């Protein structure tokens, strides 16, 4: 915190976005704003700096702006390759430190509904004294979903684990959940089912014992 | 064209304390601040303090006050971050940065690649099948192993095709479990053979296991 | 030091300068205070990280050589053994003594050369708007709020938007 | 040169016993000698002129390691070695060595107040290697092998360290 | 440098200046021109042959010395020669650097210096008719033809002729 | 040298300076006088006593060393003992040839460097109450009477007393 952005913005190519950036007196009011630009698993890049100078290799469709405690960064003509994290940030006078915003996650504007695979516990596994419940997420966009567990036709409180979405090669998104039982409970029902839901639409799979 | 190279991946237990460090090649950087930043997962990028060596400077952020030293060694090229008595909350990915300046107020223009510290005591996969028209789907669950990362073929290599291995879950244990799936012709069930090769370095773990029908 | 500056005109250091090694205090209708100039600081530091590194490159890399310990006496080469050591010796220690005093005698002068650099610089953005009281500060002679301020230390000032004010005020 | 590697040569000594030992220099329980050197003594009633060669066809330099016994008295240089002087030569195309033992005492070490000389003899490639001797010769048993590079040697007691 | 001219208030130097090292560019009402100056520009020229004249001086004579290959492996005596030469060759490489590196802080300096110099010396002449714009240029008060600015540039520039003219367009 | 005042803007010395290295000459209305600045010539005194006494400081005590004449031809050793003493006496020959190359320049740019020091003190205490007349003189723009000249040289010069009438005759 400190500096505050909208957590998303998205655009088609082509379209003019702008991200806002809002601080205080002792930050952006007195001092100058960075941008930068982060893909997923990648270092952050100096997008504007000094408020609205742009590095030589920066397009000149990126362009940043300050009036009072407030900034934002216009990207023109948007394209493809935009969609990354932004972040703001600025010397902060009170706190005698670099501060950044929290980030904004710009999204280039067709919905894919989730592929979902639904494996039951390895017999091997059995024999382990353990059972796990492996639900498969996959193609899917926007890159958000919930998985709820179905033990018989009632809802798991229990041992499920559900990874964050990922996004894959195709620029669509892939997640996966874990619902972890005793090989009884395995054995003290006959269905269950992972129910992931996507844009108010739900997709199921169901593997019996 | 300096390039800032950090230290690699680092696996610590809670109280611990973890040095990092960033080498600046192809030129100097000791005439600038270097700062360090820190994105915990899923979080944004968050400021530790910085150094700016020949200038004399180091500043570090109040909320880490106390619990880090940063360091620079103006012979080698090198800085270094050292954060002490790690719990959870400190893990994350840890960047260098050099500002465009001896001071910190600059953009920062230059960035290490990172360096990702997970605050387990290292532990090899137990590996099972997930047992499968026109196409099926066949692949492993690569269970309760630390740390990251873990590598999975099919078929020694010789399987590419439809192979699509998950982001692993990181579990409530602190262990982490992974699935790796592959998409194939079902005629192609009777005939091939399909076996996945799980390789976890850390704890010299390889163990291959066929998946049958 | 050579320019005068650094422990000259300018009469001392400020302890309170923490965030630069060079850098403006002012005084004006809205209040007071200073700011770091950050490319003579930058320059300064710049050229001694410069000659530091000139200094700790490249150490010789050396193997096989000759001793320099002996446990017997054995006269004539052992002699030579230790003169062509004790020579080599004191040559090194020389050049060290001499590159230090050398580098440290230019470091003092180049960082009082940039302070009087920026003075200078100073001096010229104001023009007639203004005079040098001989102790590091200028007596600028029109109302200049904290952005007027700003454009003087950021190298914009537009002199002549001042300047009727100020030569009012200097020579009437 | 930084290694000690060797290569043992099958020298011909005709007519003398191989493979002296002593008690100064135990190997295991027994009585022995240094491992890269060969003492040589009288066969039977005689101690023949050993004249040997031993040529250098190899692409690198060999160092021969030879030495001379010097004896305590003259009842033990003519029991080891029958002629009551001795001498060692050895000698490449453009280089020898002539070493004339010296009977007498020496201070007594480990038991003994006669010694052993080491000299050394460099071949290069397409050289030779001759040692003609009449008695008195600690003969090498083969070659270290010499090489070029960053290697030394230092005195220290200090500790060695990871 | 150490004088803050050259690369410093002088912001760059001239291409278009081919007939001397220093010199002038001036406006007036009779249009532009250029002119080298003489005196600077040789003051810096002899200096420069003259440090060049006590460097490339006397190259030492040597007849019989030591030999420095060798065909054939010694030991001792070849060890001591080998060293002994590798000695002279590195403490004269060493003096060799550092020869030029001094020579050229020098050179450097000594420009910046005549430079600084010529600008101090003209700003002397004009005494009141004239302000120091910041940037190695001179703002004249009063209407100055191409005959008075030769007798600026020859050094015979009478200030008292202009002075109330000069004063009346600074000051009022 | 560096400064340009010794030799420079300062045309050149007074002979009838002789109890002080830096001074004053002035004119007023009680007539003409010359002063030493005493903090100037201590200074330069003071910096040249320095590095006398660091170069005359230490002679290395040396006892039992190698024989250097010879009575007779004898090759290899006499060739060597000889030939480190040659190389000894040229390398210290050459240090002591740079030591007074390098120390006699700095003195000339120290001594230089404080006479353009007290001028810049000078001119910083007068203020906008003279101007420099570009030859090491300062024009006084008022009334300046013996003790008010003495008030200059010794620093307690008060510009605010005699501001208005100087700028009266400056500008108007």
Redesign the interface.
């Known amino acids: 915190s400190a500096l505050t952005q909208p957590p998303a913005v998205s655009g088609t190519p082509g379209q003019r976005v702008t991200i806002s950036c809002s601080g205080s007196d002792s930050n952006i009011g007195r001092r100058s704003v960075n941008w930068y630009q982060q893909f997923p698993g990648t270092a952050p890049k100096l997008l504007i700096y000094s408020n609205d100078q742009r590095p030589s290799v920066v397009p000149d469709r990126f362009s940043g702006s300050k009036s009072g405690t407030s900034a934002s960064l216009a990207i023109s003509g948007l394209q493809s390759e935009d969609e990354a994290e932004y972040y703001c940030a600025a010397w902060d006078d009170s706190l005698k430190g670099a501060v950044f915003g929290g980030g904004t996650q710009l999204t280039v504007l067709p919905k894919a509904a989730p592929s979902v695979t639904l494996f039951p516990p390895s017999s091997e596994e059995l024999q382990a004294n353990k059972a796990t419940l492996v639900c498969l997420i996959s193609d899917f966009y926007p890159g958000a979903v919930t998985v709820a567990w179905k033990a018989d036709s009632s809802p798991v409180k229990a041992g499920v684990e559900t990874t964050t979405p990922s996004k894959q090669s195709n620029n669509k998104y892939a997640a996966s959940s874990y619902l972890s039982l005793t090989p009884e409970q395995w054995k003290s029902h006959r269905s269950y089912s992972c129910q992931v839901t996507h844009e108010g639409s739900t997709v199921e799979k169901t593997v019996a014992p | 064209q300096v390039q800032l190279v950090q230290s690699g991946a680092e696996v610590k237990k809670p109280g611990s304390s973890v040095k990092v460090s960033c080498k600046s090649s192809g030129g100097?950087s000791?005439?600038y601040a270097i700062?360090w930043?820190r994105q915990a997962?899923?979080q944004?990028?968050?400021?530790m303090?910085?150094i700016?060596p020949?200038?004399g400077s180091t500043?570090?952020?109040?909320k880490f006050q106390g619990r880090v030293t940063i360091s620079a060694d103006?012979?080698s090229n090198t800085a270094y971050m050292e954060l002490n008595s790690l719990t959870s909350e400190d893990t994350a990915v840890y960047?260098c940065?050099r500002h465009?300046?001896?001071?910190?107020?600059?953009?920062?223009?230059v960035?290490?690649?990172?360096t990702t510290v997970t605050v387990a005591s290292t532990k090899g996969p137990?590996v099972?099948?997930?047992?499968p028209g026109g196409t099926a789907?066949l692949?492993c669950?690569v269970?309760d192993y630390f740390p990251e990362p873990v590598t999975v073929s099919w078929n020694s290599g010789a399987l590419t095709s439809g192979v699509?291995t998950?982001?692993?879950?990181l579990?409530?244990s602190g262990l982490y479990?992974?699935?790796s799936?592959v998409t194939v012709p079902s005629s192609s069930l009777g005939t091939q053979t399909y076996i996945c090769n799980v390789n976890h370095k850390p704890s010299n773990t390889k163990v291959d296991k066929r998946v049958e029908p | 030091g050579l320019f005068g500056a650094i422990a000259g005109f300018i009469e001392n250091g400020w302890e309170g300068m923490i965030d630069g090694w060079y850098g403006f205090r002012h005084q004006n209708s809205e209040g007071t205070g200073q700011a770091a100039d950050l490319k003579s600081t930058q320059a300064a530091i710049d050229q001694i990280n410069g000659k530091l590194n000139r200094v700790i490159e490249k150490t010789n890399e050396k193997f096989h050589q000759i001793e320099k310990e002996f446990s017997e006496v054995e006269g004539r080469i052992q002699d030579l053994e230790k003169y062509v050591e004790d020579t080599k010796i004191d040559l090194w220690s020389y050049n060290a003594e001499l590159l230090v005093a050398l580098e440290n005698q230019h470091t003092i002068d180049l960082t009082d050369s940039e302070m009087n650099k920026l003075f200078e610089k100073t001096g010229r953005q104001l023009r007639e708007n203004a005079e040098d009281m001989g102790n590091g500060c200028f007596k600028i002679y029109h109302k200049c709020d904290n952005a007027c301020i700003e454009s003087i230390r950021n190298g914009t000032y537009d002199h002549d938007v001042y300047r009727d004010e100020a030569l009012n005020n200097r020579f009437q | 040169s930084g290694t000690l590697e060797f290569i043992t040569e099958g020298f011909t000594w005709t007519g003398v016993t191989q493979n002296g030992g002593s008690n100064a220099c135990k190997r295991g329980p027994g009585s022995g000698f240094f491992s890269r050197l060969n003492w040589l003594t009288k066969s039977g009633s005689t101690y023949p002129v050993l004249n040997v060669t031993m040529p250098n066809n190899d692409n690198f330099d060999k160092l021969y390691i030879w030495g001379v016994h010097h004896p305590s008295t003259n009842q033990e240089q003519t029991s080891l070695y029958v002629q009551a002087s001795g001498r060692v030569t050895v000698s490449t195309r453009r280089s020898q060595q002539t070493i004339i033992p010296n009977i007498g005492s020496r201070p007594w070490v480990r038991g003994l107040s006669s010694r052993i000389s080491i000299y050394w003899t460099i071949v290069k490639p397409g050289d030779v290697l001759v040692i003609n001797s009449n008695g008195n010769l600690i003969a090498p048993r083969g070659y270290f092998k010499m090489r070029t590079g960053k290697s030394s040697i230092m005195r220290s007691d200090a500790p060695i360290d990871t």
Do not use: E
């Open positions: 100097t000791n005439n700062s930043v997962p899923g944004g990028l968050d400021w303090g910085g700016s020949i200038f500043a570090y952020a109040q103006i012979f960047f940065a465009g300046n001896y001071y910190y107020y600059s953009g920062m223009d960035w290490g690649q990172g137990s099972f099948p997930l047992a789907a692949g669950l269970k699509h998950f982001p692993a879950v579990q409530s479990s992974l699935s799936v």
